[PDB]
Design a protein around this ligand. Structure first.
Ligand SMILES: CCCCCCCC/C=C\CCCCCCCC(=O)OC[C@H](COP(=O)(O)OCC[N+](C)(C)C)OC(=O)CCCCCCC/C=C\CCCCCCCC
Ligand SMILES: CCCCCCCC/C=C\CCCCCCCC(=O)OC[C@H](COP(=O)(O)OCC[N+](C)(C)C)OC(=O)CCCCCCC/C=C\CCCCCCCC
Ligand SMILES: CCCCCCCC/C=C\CCCCCCCC(=O)OC[C@H](COP(=O)(O)OCC[N+](C)(C)C)OC(=O)CCCCCCC/C=C\CCCCCCCC
Ligand SMILES: CCCCCCCC/C=C\CCCCCCCC(=O)OC[C@H](COP(=O)(O)OCC[N+](C)(C)C)OC(=O)CCCCCCC/C=C\CCCCCCCC
Ligand SMILES: CCCCCCCC/C=C\CCCCCCCC(=O)OC[C@H](COP(=O)(O)OCC[N+](C)(C)C)OC(=O)CCCCCCC/C=C\CCCCCCCC
Ligand SMILES: CCCCCCCC/C=C\CCCCCCCC(=O)OC[C@H](COP(=O)(O)OCC[N+](C)(C)C)OC(=O)CCCCCCC/C=C\CCCCCCCC
Ligand SMILES: CCCCCCCC/C=C\CCCCCCCC(=O)OC[C@H](COP(=O)(O)OCC[N+](C)(C)C)OC(=O)CCCCCCC/C=C\CCCCCCCC
Ligand SMILES: CCCCCCCC/C=C\CCCCCCCC(=O)OC[C@H](COP(=O)(O)OCC[N+](C)(C)C)OC(=O)CCCCCCC/C=C\CCCCCCCC
Ligand SMILES: CCCCCCCC/C=C\CCCCCCCC(=O)OC[C@H](COP(=O)(O)OCC[N+](C)(C)C)OC(=O)CCCCCCC/C=C\CCCCCCCC
Ligand SMILES: CCCCCCCC/C=C\CCCCCCCC(=O)OC[C@H](COP(=O)(O)OC[C@H](N)C(=O)O)OC(=O)CCCCCCC/C=C\CCCCCCCC
Ligand SMILES: CCCCCCCC/C=C\CCCCCCCC(=O)OC[C@H](COP(=O)(O)OC[C@H](N)C(=O)O)OC(=O)CCCCCCC/C=C\CCCCCCCC
Lengths: 198, 198
């Protein structure tokens, strides 16, 4: 009955609020009407004058924009002409280098890579020797390491059997009564919660 | 209660671990010896050959570095001159643009700003006329709203006190017996809980 009576206090509040919301909206709408009414009178000024002035405003900016566009176009032509001539000259100077210095770079690259090839050839040969030596050393040792690891694993497993058998059985032998004692507490605890929560 | 039994089992596993550690580390060290010495067989040749590899490699790289460095002297240096003249030309091209177009942009700015002067000032003044009416409406509706809010405040306060009294009465009149009931449930709960956690 707690929530039932408490809800009544909430319901009455809603009723009181609803009876107040009426006048609230009535007066608020009334005040809003004056607000919008004023804004309407203002709209007949704001938009009216902004439209009456939008003509000379836009025409002014447009006129000047046209001048700006004309001036820009009157400049863009000779400017592009200068840029084009300059570009041709500058690009030509670049071509005067891309060709000789380009071939020079290619010719030097020939030597660069040729020396590299003549270096990589014996290098890789010796690298193969290194790999052969390293892999073989790691192989002979690898087999021993694997054999040793097998022994270590064998000893690990045999000792693990001291855990998988005795220790595990011991744990189970402990778990059994542990679970039983836990069952006792769990059973009573469940009764406890149920006795108080219901 | 049987933690001693479990702990002993853990102790046994620790001893078994040590029984492993001894032999395992012994052969592991023997393994490490094979690894260290084995790796040394590789490392000796590796390091010795590294000397016979890095020396002619740095030399080869230095040769290429010279070709590249000297190459850059016959490329970057003259190109710096080509680009210098090109930049100077471009700067001249730009200077002959930033001056006329620069003052032109300023003239445009003058025409736009002066326009904005007679476009923003008069408009803001008209906006002042509008804002005055807007604020006047807001002040009127605000004055009314202040009264409405004041009235509604008293109406809401009366409904609040009209609720607070009986609500607090019923709430306390509910809390009093409910607390006693809660105490009973809590006392029985605690009393029995300590019995299970005994
Ligand atoms: C059937 C279903 C029923 C439904 C349930 C309804 C029943 C609920 C019943 C009662 C609720 C009322 C709450 C208790 C009344 C508060 C009394 C009060 O005024 O108590 C203030 C104390 C703070 O101590 P003090 O400094 O005043 O005292 C030390 C004084 N010496 C240092 C200053 C001098 O507070 C305390 O006792 C309270 C604990 C500490 C308060 C810390 C402040 C917490 C603030 C905000 C938490 C907001 C979480 C929201 C964020 C979520 C984001 C997602
Ligand atoms: C239909 C169902 C609808 C849903 C229901 C909604 C729930 C509403 C009901 C209950 C809410 C539970 C909260 C009650 C807690 C008490 C608040 C209060 O009363 O605490 C008074 C104190 C006085 O200050 P002190 O230094 O002595 O206390 C400092 C003391 N210590 C440090 C312990 C805190 O205040 C403070 O602690 C800090 C507060 C400062 C307040 C300044 C007021 C400024 C004026 C106007 C702000 C307008 C807000 C508009 C929102 C409308 C609200 C109706
Ligand atoms: C201390 C005393 C404090 C005084 C407190 C004042 C309380 C008055 C305020 C609010 C009344 C709360 C009413 C709650 C009752 C439940 C109504 C209901 O049956 O609720 C459920 C419905 C439907 O579920 P749903 O649509 O939410 O879920 C959508 C999710 N799906 C689709 C999965 C279903 O929810 C809906 O109908 C959505 C309802 C959202 C409407 C909230 C009320 C907004 C009121 C005013 C807005 C302000 C206008 C002013 C601005 C004008 C400036 C000129
Ligand atoms: C939420 C927490 C965030 C808080 C941050 C913001 C606070 C700052 C305060 C206010 C700024 C809010 C402005 C954004 C306006 C909301 C727009 C919106 O998201 O709206 C949604 C509503 C809901 O409906 P709907 O979208 O489902 O339907 C339309 C769809 N259809 C086609 C499907 C059926 O749309 C409607 O109610 C329909 C609208 C009908 C338009 C009528 C226009 C009448 C003309 C003039 C009125 C005069 C105003 C005077 C100026 C006074 C300024 C003080
Ligand atoms: C007294 C009262 C006066 C005060 C007024 C002052 C303000 C007036 C200013 C702007 C209002 C615009 C008026 C609406 C009228 C038309 C709108 C419209 O439709 O005009 C169409 C245009 C063009 O479109 P079109 O390609 O079809 O025509 C191009 C076709 N030709 C090339 C192919 C041939 O469009 C446009 O002018 C669209 C430009 C606007 C861009 C909107 C997209 C926004 C995108 C994302 C929202 C991001 C929010 C970011 C938040 C972060 C903030 C930090
Ligand atoms: C951990 C052992 C302790 C070592 C110490 C004692 C030594 C014992 C003696 C010898 C060791 C023998 C080594 C054998 C281990 C190889 C494991 C392996 O080959 O694994 C990779 C496999 C790959 O998957 P798949 O090809 O079989 O499946 C694909 C299935 N499809 C395609 C078929 C359907 O995965 C599997 O077999 C999944 C097996 C998941 C194993 C989870 C073990 C988590 C234990 C500890 C993590 C934390 C260590 C940090 C301790 C910090 C202490 C401070
Ligand atoms: C002293 C200590 C001892 C010494 C130790 C060092 C030993 C290391 C040994 C050899 C180095 C080679 C490493 C990379 C292995 C792959 C070699 C190979 O078979 O590669 C083939 C690729 C394929 O290219 P494609 O022309 O057939 O395909 C063009 C296709 N389409 C046109 C559709 C775009 O060739 C490429 O990625 C390269 C061609 C693209 C050129 C890119 C620019 C590179 C910049 C500077 C030259 C750097 C030389 C340094 C070596 C690194 C090479 C990546
Ligand atoms: C001892 C050895 C010395 C090494 C010296 C090397 C530098 C000396 C300079 C020049 C001569 C060597 C030339 C090597 C450069 C050419 C790389 C190349 O063959 O490029 C071709 C790619 C093709 O693109 P795609 O659209 O046809 O393929 C997209 C189509 N799909 C997706 C199907 C594949 O790119 C293009 O053609 C676009 C070209 C963009 C330019 C890339 C140049 C990158 C080089 C260096 C910048 C590094 C900055 C790192 C900073 C660290 C400093 C320590
Ligand atoms: C239905 C509508 C009716 C109106 C309801 C009025 C009745 C009150 C009823 C219930 C309580 C509502 C809950 C208030 C919310 C708690 C806010 C809070 O947690 O507040 C304390 C915190 C703590 O920081 P602090 O105090 O050290 O810093 C203050 C900094 N200070 C000096 C620099 C400016 O403050 C902050 O987070 C900083 C924010 C402080 C803002 C103060 C606002 C001052 C404005 C006007 C004062 C008007 C009083 C007239 C009352 C009108 C009755 C009709
Ligand atoms: C860590 C990230 C680095 C990224 C850098 C990106 C920027 C690239 C832009 C321009 C190229 C670099 C242009 C470098 C110009 C050198 C500028 C210079 O004087 O630098 C000095 C510093 C010294 O630092 P310290 O901390 O040692 O001492 C600071 C000192 N006390 C102080 O108060 O300043 O040394 C340095 O950091 C610079 C080392 C220069 C050695 C190599 C000089 C290069 C010479 C020739 C070029 C040959 C090109 C070879 C490459 C071809 C391809 C294979
Ligand atoms: C009457 C029965 C009713 C039944 C109740 C059933 C439910 C019980 C469950 C929850 C209710 C308890 C709710 C307790 C809420 C505690 C709220 C609180 O103030 O917490 C703070 C403490 C802080 O401890 P620390 O004090 O040691 O502080 C030092 C801190 N680092 C510093 O620099 O200052 O944090 C801690 O409590 C944790 C560390 C505690 C250290 C001591 C830990 C000591 C723990 C146990 C005691 C020894 C066991 C003896 C055997 C008896 C059992 C048979």
């Amino acid at each position: 009955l707690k929530l039932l009576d408490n809800w009544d206090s909430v319901t009455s509040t809603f009723s009181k609020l609803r009876e107040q919301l009426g006048p609230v909206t009535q007066e608020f709408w009334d005040n809003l009407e004056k607000e919008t009414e004023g804004l309407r009178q203002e709209m007949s000024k704001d938009l009216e004058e902004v439209k009456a002035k939008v003509q000379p405003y836009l025409d002014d900016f447009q006129k000047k924009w046209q001048e700006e566009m004309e001036l820009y176009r009157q400049k863009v032509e000779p400017l592009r002409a200068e840029l084009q001539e300059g570009a041709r000259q500058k690009l030509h100077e670049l071509q005067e280098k891309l060709s000789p210095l380009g071939e020079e770079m290619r010719d030097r690259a020939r030597a660069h890579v040729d020396a590299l090839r003549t270096h990589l050839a014996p290098y890789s040969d010796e690298l193969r020797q290194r790999l052969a030596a390293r892999l073989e050393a790691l192989k002979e040792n690898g087999g021993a390491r694997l054999a040793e690891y097998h022994a270590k694993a064998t000893e690990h497993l045999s000792t693990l059997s001291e855990k998988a058998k005795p220790a595990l059985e011991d744990l189970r032998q402990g778990l059994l009564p542990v679970l039983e004692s836990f069952k006792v507490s769990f059973l009573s605890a469940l009764e406890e919660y149920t006795k108080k929560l219901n």
